[PDB]
Amino acid sequence: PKMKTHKGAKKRVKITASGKVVAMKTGKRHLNWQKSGKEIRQKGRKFVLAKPEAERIKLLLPY
């Protein structure tokens, strides 16, 4: 029984009040692009449009 929620997932994400499955994304990990040129910059967070639902659950004991 018990169900000891999973740390990792919780190591990043969060439900902003509204119950919205929101958190960080993946990208500008210190360029990993190179090109002195320009771009990297662009970054931020984002919900999930169909999985999000699922996730939140395995964290109903830990919060």
Partner: protein, 146 residues
């Protein structure tokens, strides 16, 4: 009283289940062309994904996952007035928190939004908001230091 056919109070339904039968819709399951029913049938905890479930991500929030301990710091407790401007007699925690509701808070912080009776209440740290609501129009105390 009596046993005047005390059925129930409207809505409930033990809606049990059952084995097999030939009545109504009895006998079936719903799926097919989707194998997954096993002795230890999946479970089923989320499972599936068939696409890492969009777990191509990665963690950045680095401040935990260390090992023995976590971060140790005496309690952090603020507040709001529109909670008990009711009684005061002497607004001091323990009398509150320790009562009505609210849990431990080593160091005291205060705010919220609404109004109240500017009366001296434990303040191991407060907000300018209260200052004015408890200065030339109120009463505020001091912190620990022991």
């Amino acid at each position: 009283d009596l046993r005047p056919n005390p059925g129930a109070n409207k809505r409930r339904k033990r809606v049990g289940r059952g084995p097999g039968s030939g009545h109504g819709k009895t006998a079936t399951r719903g799926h097919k062309g989707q194998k997954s029913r096993s002795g230890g049938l999946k479970d089923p905890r989320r499972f599936e994904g068939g696409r890492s479930t969009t777990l191509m991500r990665l963690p950045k929030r680095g401040m935990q996952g260390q090992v023995p301990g976590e971060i140790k710091r005496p309690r952090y407790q603020g507040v709001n007035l529109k909670d008990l401007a009711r009684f005061e007699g002497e607004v001091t925690p323990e009398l509150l928190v320790r009562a009505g509701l609210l849990k431990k808070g080593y160091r005291l912080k205060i705010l919220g939004e609404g109004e109240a009776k500017p009366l001296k209440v434990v303040a191991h740290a407060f907000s300018k908001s209260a200052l004015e609501k408890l200065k030339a129009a109120g009463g505020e105390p001091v912190l620990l230091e022991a």
